[model samples]
Target chain A: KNSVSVDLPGSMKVLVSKSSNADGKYDLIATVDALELSGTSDKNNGSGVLEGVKADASKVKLTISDDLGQTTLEVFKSDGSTLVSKKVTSKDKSSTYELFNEKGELSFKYITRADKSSTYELFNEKGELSFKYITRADKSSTYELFNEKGELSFKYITRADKSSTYELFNEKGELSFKYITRADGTRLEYTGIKSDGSGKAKEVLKGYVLEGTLTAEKTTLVVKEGTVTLSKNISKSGEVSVELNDTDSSAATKKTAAWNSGTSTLTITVNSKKTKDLVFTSSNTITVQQYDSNGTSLEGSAVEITKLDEIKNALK
Target chain B: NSVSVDLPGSMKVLVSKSSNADGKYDLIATVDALELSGTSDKNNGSGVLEGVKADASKVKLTISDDLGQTTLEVFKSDGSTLVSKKVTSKDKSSTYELFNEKGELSFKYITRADKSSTYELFNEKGELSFKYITRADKSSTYELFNEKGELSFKYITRADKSSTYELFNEKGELSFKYITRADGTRLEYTGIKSDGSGKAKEVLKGYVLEGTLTAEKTTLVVKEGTVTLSKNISKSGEVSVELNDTDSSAATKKTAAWNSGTSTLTITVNSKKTKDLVFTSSNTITVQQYDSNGTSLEGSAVEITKLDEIKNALK
Candidate 1:
């Protein structure tokens, strides 16, 4: 509840009368000529002015300001804990939002366009995230996935000149799935799926999903207890080769992961005698694309701007 | 060694290179003139000053002046202990006596006749010992006594009171003694003594009895370990009872030393307590004589006349 009064320089300076603002709540009202504010009140306000103030146990309010912009300065209680601040800036054209925890620890900041269709999120101590979701700017959802540990797991953004979208892993939190829309809007997925021998999914993904499937394109074999099985999938295929080496050291032998090319297939293996009875067998895949031509390989392509004719018409 | 010289100042500066006058060793001279003749030179004496001519360290001399007297002033060590001093008019007519190691008085004299017969003796801290005076002239016999209170030596001044007769101690130490006669005649004994015990007695006389004696009968007793007396004086026509309890305590026993009822005077002191051996008398005694600084001012200014009377009465 807000109540106010005015103080005269040479008259009765009313302190307080009576109120039920007690116990968990108390209020103090001080009315004094603004110019007589001595000691700590020196340099408070303009000369020859009076002030009326009311303060509760938890809040303070004063109503004596000439300038609209300088009418208020807010001080929030920390609620017996560190304070968390959120600055909300809004305008006719754009707005900015910054959130800080009670410890003055900055959490995140974001800016949104007037249409609210595009936004940029700056996280932790770093600048703006590379993955931004823009509607009018690119008509693509650029999602940046972060783990609960605050580590960036993956980034996805659509290439302006190309139909295929690009995705990257900034940390090793985990990648459950990734999806890319080709120039023709066709989607492909790499889904991390854990299945039993009966081909039934066991562990459901808990980290992130980027549009489509969560499975490998190639198969990697792993041997355990004298039995060989799939390990991981290879994303590329070529002439693959294998090499083997052994050591007599007490330290665990490092099963170095390497790729090899033979006449028809590519193989990635870890050759070591320390895992004596363990063997690995893997498989790869070669998928066909619509843009591929004989000897006209997708080696390079130039980006072109078709907006030149539109800019020329605007000038005329 | 025979030698002599004369100097001047407030002190009697007699620079004697040697002593040749017999019975005249006890000498006293006053430096009447501070300057030549009579002016106060402020130190430079009549040009014939011997202390300035001869090195003060090579010879022995004695000078007396108003500044210091009644004591040996200087005893140097170079070429013998050159002794020099001056006797002033303030020391006008006095006697000097030497004593043996046994506390005996060796020699005595009367310095100047026309001067006062009173003299003072002072100890090291300049405290006065006693003031003494002479009633008879220098020609009369004065006795010097031994520590046992007996007359051990005597000096009978001859008719020629102007002669300076010096008396020396047995060790040849100079004697300081003088005497004055009644008719303006002075007799100074510098080197003489009584004849009979000259070779045997080494001490001096004690008292010079001058006036006629009026002997009285007295009684002495030791009460409370002291000598006391009951005396009757024929001259004063007085009878008195006294005690000689010097220790100021009660008497446990009484002892008598002398008893006579007709003595004119009585003496009492610590006699019973063997360690308290002191002599005290029971009467008001005058020890020194008084005189004017002037002799016979036949005539002069009234101021001088008044000054003479004032100086004469000054104790």
Candidate 2:
């Protein structure tokens, strides 16, 4: 018989016992006022029975505290570090579960809300809420995802009215895309803002149709029926040309207007005109010279420059 | 003395014995096996605790020889009827669904190649109400259906980095649309008719000051400097009018001045001292009755100002 016994230093009470059973099987049992087991090791494995709950080996360790009336179950990695821990509330019978990353930081939590709803929340390494999903009282749900800066990046909602909505935002919390669907209809919108704080907005239509609108600090571009209308003036430097195509002859005529800012003069020319140049002078005169198709000057076809006030009165 | 004993015809064995040492009453106990019994009514509570394992009054967690398969099931109030069950698989997982009080499927999931995934939700009438997907390229999508199970809205992104986000009318036609190019430009079109024929019509440049500009007919009224030029087709269908403003304030006024039904044209100069009434109906005509600034001369008293030969030749 291999029998062992332990007692208090000055008392007859047996604190622990190790003895052989009738079949010579050895069992070490303890009956103590309290027990504490704590140590740090590279790896640890221990198993024991508690009340009526069976203990099994599945990379999970179990612990119980009698004074606090609490039970905890923890899952560990191969290195014997905790990966997930679950605690059961003895008073309300609710459970709280937390998962940790490889760096031993809490990354996810599954908990119960005060309204008896269940929620799952994911956190970044910095312990910021990266994603969360909540089931509400009416059984509808909402989900939201966050960026690294803890800004809301995306959100989706299912409502009790059978409608749904989704929204997406940038890192700066600016709304970039949104879609909503109700019993009546659905709509999808996208917004893109440039660095200058100007933005373009778009709406999607059926049959692969896309419509966009842009707004600047000064003007807006409104497009309708394949036409783009500018609500302001258009300014251009240098020469301007207008081209007209002749359908019958397959020829084109180009008219150009050149402006001389220094002289405050404008000149116009045509390809088929006999005049080499039709010049208008600031000195209040217009001169015209006629030429043949071969570039030969026509005899006596030149018109002398006349007074502008006389010409103006005669035209009026 | 303390002794342990096993029960017959059951998996459980129990030990119940105690040893008393001091008057304070110390006891040593050993349990070779255990058994528990409770009510047998289907609606009543019962449990059993054996060694390190326990059975509760609620549903149990069971595993099958399928190895990777695990299921959690709930039953109706009838106790024997199953309401829902959730089973997980090896690579991909799906859940046996439950219906709401109105007999609608709670949710559904679908799997595709290349690790693509999809989820669908239903209304109370068992109609698919909402759908969501995540493509292999990490693009997420969503779709909503009407009561008749037609696609009412969809927002999707493709693996090639393109997206189709649109809404549908009651007839399942596109009502609104938005698209973005790779370069970050966007196009949004709305007010679509049922036959898919509607677009923005625009005049790109210039202004239509008067009349119209088209290929079949062209008339240009352009103004340059002090000249207003009008080129138009004459009544005979020829390019006939190329009028210039030499001494008129307006082109139309000058034209009207020339067409005033007066055949005799006159020129006057303040310094020139001669005035003559000349008639020239033929190639050669005569000049008579010359006067200075004042009038009144007769017979040989009529002083000729210039040569008749020069006047006839000039005509």
Candidate 3:
């Protein structure tokens, strides 16, 4: 925190916080005495001195000067080189801080603007951009990550309304995946392209896609690609509705229905046994494949539904 | 009117007697300039302001902390620095630094634990550019550093008053060396060289030349007899370089003056005078042994040097 006051008569005092030390305190404050309307008495740049002082543990000294509208703090290395610096502007009530590496190359920086927005940037030892996070005047924020070979690899954005999205891109600079969260729901999306870059993504199923979400009113679920669309809706009463529509609906059409189009009921007791069955039925016959708790599929022969009924009678 | 702060944390008071708008300092304190003295929460110390010259006109301020370390400073009225001195009583040494206009430590003198001392001068950026060291043994060494604080040249004077020096080129490779001993002085300018057929060279005695003096404009110096080119290939004097031939009882009988920008060398040797002997470091030096009207029959045993030698030799 910066402490400013008229500690002395008609004098302004300013102090600096050592970058790493008691993040709580400020070291400097040069009081300007309009009192010295004619000349300079001693203004603490060092009375009769200007620089080359060291801090206790940090080994870097701090320099604070208030040129009235601008208050500057500079951190100098033992060699009298600049290692870090910060400036506070009275006009806009903002502050900027810059940090340099041992080579005096800029490595990290941050700025708090007048609107209370902020920006932070990081660079590699060579001063190459590594990442940047920014908050706009409206409080919207964005974070961008970069790579040496590519300008950007990942980005995340949060709007003032509390909505946010995180996105990833491939080396080819193509959007690969995106995760979004809003007040109502959350969603995950993926993009796949063929050699010709014309592949329509499909499958919003669990264990396969497990991506998008839905609202009870279906307002939260929205999926679309070109002229095709897929949506899901859920309600508080444990009811779910899913639909798919498109100009080219050929992808969903399978040669077999697996199970007859007639309605069926499934009843099960939780945790009774740890076994699973994948069954393909044709009318009165059932072709069953079994698996243990580990979910490895096992081969099994086809059985007639009548035979299963006979076995049930025998058990009774 | 004078102002004072009655705070417990700060008591060693110093107020400006006058503003620093002009380059003068008028300081008032509790002592001569000091208004009060006390301890603070972080520091247990006191200060004294001394009237070194006159009352408040030119004074000194010294502040000492509990650690026995002291700071001596003089402020200019315009808020600029006059000089800053730091004393470490425990260490038994102190340092005095002077600042440039930009408030950079342009020069500093440091006292060693013993009677030895060192002085350092910095460039515009405050980087070490020159350093001088005097050891307890009464020997002194002068070193020059580039703006980056890299050593460029060093001359060491031993207690016997004999000296040796070495200079490095841009690559920091030793380009010239002068070693002294009882037998004689050995001069070597051997590095990148050419036959004077092409590249620049500083020829000594008009016969033995160090290759690659690297054509510096103006000022050609030729001195009769055994003289080493002690300075730089191209040198600057306050205004003009003096050419001397000191082998006889009245050695300065003949003299040469070198002026740059004017690119003219005027010299009279062996009673022969030349108004113009265009000498640039790139070209091999010819003696006062030249020309149509003013220069003639001046050929004799001679050495050529542009000169830093004159300064070193005088030192």
Q: For this target, which candidate reaches the highest TM-score against the unseen true structure?
A: 3
Candidate 2 segments exceeding 4 Å error: A1-71, A75-83, A88-90, A122-129, A188-190, A193-316, B1-315
Model 2 chain B poorest ten-residue lDDT run:
B200-209
TM-score, chain A, per candidate? 0.28, 0.39, 0.44
Interface RMSD of each: 65.6, 39.1, 31.6
Question: Fnat of candidate 3, please?
Answer: 0.00
lDDT of 2 by residue, B34-133 (tens): 1232211121111122112122212222223333444444443433444344555544444545433233354555554457777765544567756678
Fnat for model 1 comes to 0.00
- Candidate 2 lDDT over A208-295, as tens digits, reads 2123333343223222211111121111221212111222332234433334445433333335443233333332234455456654
| Candidate 2: true interface contacts recovered | 0.00
RMSD of every prediction = 63.1, 52.5, 37.6
- Model 1 per-residue lDDT at A37: 21
Cα lDDT over the full model 1: 0.29
TM-score of chain B of each: 0.22, 0.40, 0.44
Clashes of 1: 88
DockQ of candidate 1 (2 decimals): 0.00
lDDT per residue as tens, model 3, A139-172: 7889776655636656779897787776655556
